[PDB]
């Protein structure tokens, strides 16, 4: 893999999250009920600014950091980032259990979101429609979506491991009489 730049992305992410807080502040000031003005935007707003900034900071910082600590690109990183984000959002309610719950469940949802590829879109070339499928023809390596009538035994022993009934050679032939 190629490492991430933690502070460069975190500074961009914070300015972005500050901008989103400004937009949501203005939109609330317009959509709200009672007498207001241009002052109320950052006074009477329910923490939209600190919500957005703390989330974007914590998410991107944790994803890039754990991508660099684990030294990989995968879904476990998005899980840790959603765990931080849940901590931040749940710290607003000043309770321990809801803080722990917000953390775990935001983390599981972002961790699933990284499992499925960390995108709401689709790859469109790793998909089944645009990829080889069906029966492989002649002894060729079995890809993901391909089907096979008879699998190699060496590949089985490697993917699984030996023992628990599963062996390099069958049991009868292994114990056949040399006759």
């Amino acid at each position: 893999f190629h490492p991430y730049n933690t502070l460069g992305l975190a500074t961009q992410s914070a300015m972005v999250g500050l901008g989103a807080g400004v937009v949501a502040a203005a939109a609330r000031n317009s959509l709200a009920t009672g007498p207001r003005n241009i002052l109320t935007t950052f006074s009477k707003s329910g923490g939209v600014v600190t919500i957005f900034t703390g989330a974007s900071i914590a998410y991107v910082f944790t994803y890039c950091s754990a991508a660099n600590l684990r030294e990989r690109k995968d879904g476990w990183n998005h899980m840790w980032a959603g765990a931080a984000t849940g901590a931040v959002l749940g710290a607003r309610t000043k309770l321990v259990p809801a803080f722990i719950g917000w953390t775990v469940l935001c983390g599981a949802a972002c961790g699933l979101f990284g499992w499925t590829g960390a995108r709401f879109n689709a790859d469109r070339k790793a998909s089944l429609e645009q990829s080889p499928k069906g029966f492989v023809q002649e002894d060729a390596h079995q890809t993901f979506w391909e089907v096979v009538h008879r699998r190699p035994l060496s590949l089985t022993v490697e993917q699984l491991g030996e023992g628990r009934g599963i062996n390099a050679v069958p049991i009868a032939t292994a114990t056949e009489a040399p006759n």
Binding site: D139, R150, R151, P152, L153, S154, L155, T156, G165, I166, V169, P170, I171, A172, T175
Partner: peptide, 18 residues
């Protein structure tokens, strides 16, 4: 340990020649 049921699937779904 050898003379016991051990099923067909593990030979039907595994060619030992590879």
């Amino acid at each position: 340990p050898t003379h016991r049921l051990q099923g067909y699937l593990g030979y039907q779904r595994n060619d030992p020649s590879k």
